[PDB]
Design a protein around this ligand. Structure first.
Ligand SMILES: *[C@@H]1O[C@H](CO)[C@@H](O[C@@H]2O[C@H](CO)[C@@H](O[C@@H]3O[C@H](CO[C@H]4O[C@H](CO)[C@@H](O)[C@H](O)[C@@H]4O[C@@H]4O[C@H](CO)[C@@H](O[C@@H]5O[C@H](CO)[C@H](O)[C@H](O)[C@H]5O)[C@H](O)[C@H]4NC(C)=O)[C@@H](O)[C@H](O[C@H]4O[C@H](CO)[C@@H](O)[C@H](O)[C@@H]4O[C@@H]4O[C@H](CO)[C@@H](O)[C@H](O)[C@H]4NC(C)=O)[C@@H]3O)[C@H](O)[C@H]2NC(C)=O)[C@H](O)[C@H]1NC(C)=O
Ligand SMILES: *[C@@H]1O[C@H](CO)[C@@H](O[C@@H]2O[C@H](CO)[C@@H](O[C@@H]3O[C@H](CO[C@H]4O[C@H](CO)[C@@H](O)[C@H](O)[C@@H]4O[C@@H]4O[C@H](CO)[C@@H](O)[C@H](O)[C@H]4NC(C)=O)[C@@H](O)[C@H](O[C@H]4O[C@H](CO)[C@@H](O)[C@H](O)[C@@H]4O[C@@H]4O[C@H](CO)[C@@H](O)[C@H](O)[C@H]4NC(C)=O)[C@@H]3O)[C@H](O)[C@H]2NC(C)=O)[C@H](O)[C@H]1NC(C)=O
Ligand SMILES: [Cl-]
Lengths: 215, 212
């Protein structure tokens, strides 16, 4: 059955994916999400502002039934790459009948001097070579803001069998992370060059790439 | 949902404490939003269902927001927690229509032995004043672990360890990074990544790393 929701809906406002802001070929988005919307008063009205000035290009998604008999209602505003990076503030305003006033939320990029990531690749431990799979390692560090993207490639083709860590606040107020790519030991032993690819605003052309292979 | 009354939060012990026998692990039961009007709080502590006493409860402390906070701390037997015994805090108070019960215990699932490998700095980094010594730990379960860096029997200062990340096989890995001055590296001192996990012989293993 439906819960009581005495407080009405609530808003959450997410930023663009870091890759999207950085590659001009891609489409960056802010995403305003309203939850705890009732069946009785399910209309949500959205107003979007950039640095105070209103914009109308938002896309209006259909509402979605959740497991608790409330609606999840989203508006999505595409944005320009330079604006976000320049730190324009993106304000979502939400108006629903079950509230006494509109709820406003804002999101900009983190403030603070951006810092270039230093990218280092590290081969497998001597002790891991007994295993059938090995761990190739990419360390990204001394970067700010935390917004970053990392993938792997070999010989022109993407390698997808990796996991990257969340960024970690280092002790000089920069961030670091480790990505780890698991590959078959043969592909390593054959002499194939794998590559860490890192994307971040402080990097030249938002892109750098370190390679790594048997020696 | 329970609306209008004190609230209860139950905390597990530090992993490092559950593992080493020299240390004393504790389950901590915090009660907040206790009024001055009804400030008396009764703690009942159950193990697997068996009521237990010997929990050391501290006197209530006045909070900035003018509520009271109260804490009861159960000491736990290292073995008990690992064998996975359930721990229960029952909080009674007049303001509460019915008393509040919380339970916690070690995460369920088959324990799995971490592997630990140490990675010297990348050649590229040998340019810098400081450098990164990297300890990769993976294949472990549950996610509760403890990782430290050492040299000459003493803990190293400037290191940071990522949170556990869930690998594709249902195990976790992390990475721990130690920073040092290059000189210490090249004069070829020795550094040690220590790891404490439930599923290692003596809940401990360490691996060294030195210039070569
Ligand atoms: C008046 O003022 C009061 C104080 O200012 C204020 O009290 C606060 O009320 C908050 C709620 O209203 C309460 O918020 C909870 O916070 C939980 C996390 O608390 C820890 O982390 C905080 C920092 O982030 C610390 O400040 C806290 O003190 C606490 O820190 C931990 O403390 C323990 C014990 O002290 C300690 O463990 C012990 O360590 C020692 C070492 O000395 C020993 O080794 C012992 O062995 C060991 O036990 C920890 O080290 C320490 N951790 C630190 C410092 O990091 C948070 O978990 C709660 O969130 C959950 O529940 C809410 C429901 O409210 C959910 O909305 C939320 O999503 C979380 O939900 C849970 O998630 C689980 C995991 O995902 C999930 O499995 C569960 O299903 C789910 N539900 C649960 C568990 O029910 C919550 O936010 C805050 O702690 C209170 N502050 C204090 C100091 O108690 C009060 O509100 C004010 N009142 C008014 C009216 O204004
Ligand atoms: C009924 O049913 C509903 C369906 O489940 C349920 O909805 C859920 O409601 C909760 C709130 O109760 C809401 O939780 C919030 O989640 C935020 C993160 O959401 C992410 O990640 C989760 C999983 O991690 C996803 O499921 C979400 O969908 C969302 O995914 C992102 O979505 C966007 C848009 O699609 C994508 O672009 C992203 O890629 C995608 N991410 C991922 C990983 O997939 C979380 O941030 C919120 O926490 C903050 O507010 C809390 C308030 O409850 C604070 O306690 C908490 O501290 C956080 O505070 C913030 O802290 C920041 C950093 O520390 C600060 O910078 C901020 O200033 C500060 N902000 C605030 C507001 O405090 C929050 O936990 C779920 O998102 C939501 N489910 C969905 C699907 O949206 C209803 O609640 C149910 N209700 C009832 C009554 O039963
Ligand atoms: Cl905790």
């Amino acid at each position: 059955p439906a819960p009581e929701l005495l407080g009405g809906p609530s808003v959450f406002l997410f930023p663009p994916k870091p890759k999207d802001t950085l590659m001009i070929s891609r489409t960056p988005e802010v995403t305003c999400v309203v939850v705890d919307v009732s069946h009785e008063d399910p209309e949500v009205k959205f107003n979007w502002y950039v640095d105070g000035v209103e914009v109308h290009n938002a896309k209006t998604k259909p509402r979605e039934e959740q497991w608790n008999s409330t609606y999840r209602v989203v508006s999505v505003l595409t944005v320009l790459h330079q604006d976000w990076l320049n730190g324009k503030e993106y304000k979502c305003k939400v108006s629903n009948k079950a509230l006494p006033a509109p709820i406003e939320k804002t999101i900009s990029k983190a403030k603070g001097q951006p810092r270039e990531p230093q990218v280092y690749t590290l081969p497998p431990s001597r002790d891991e070579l007994t295993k059938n799979q090995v761990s190739l390692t990419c360390l990204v560090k001394g970067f700010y803001p935390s917004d970053i993207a990392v993938e792997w490639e070999s010989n022109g083709q993407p390698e997808n069998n990796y996991k990257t860590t969340p960024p970690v606040l280092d002790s000089d107020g920069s961030f670091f992370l480790y990505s780890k790519l698991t590959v078959d030991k043969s592909r390593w032993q054959q002499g194939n060059v794998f590559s860490c690819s890192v994307m971040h605003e402080a990097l030249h052309n938002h892109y750098t790439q370190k390679s790594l292979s048997l020696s």
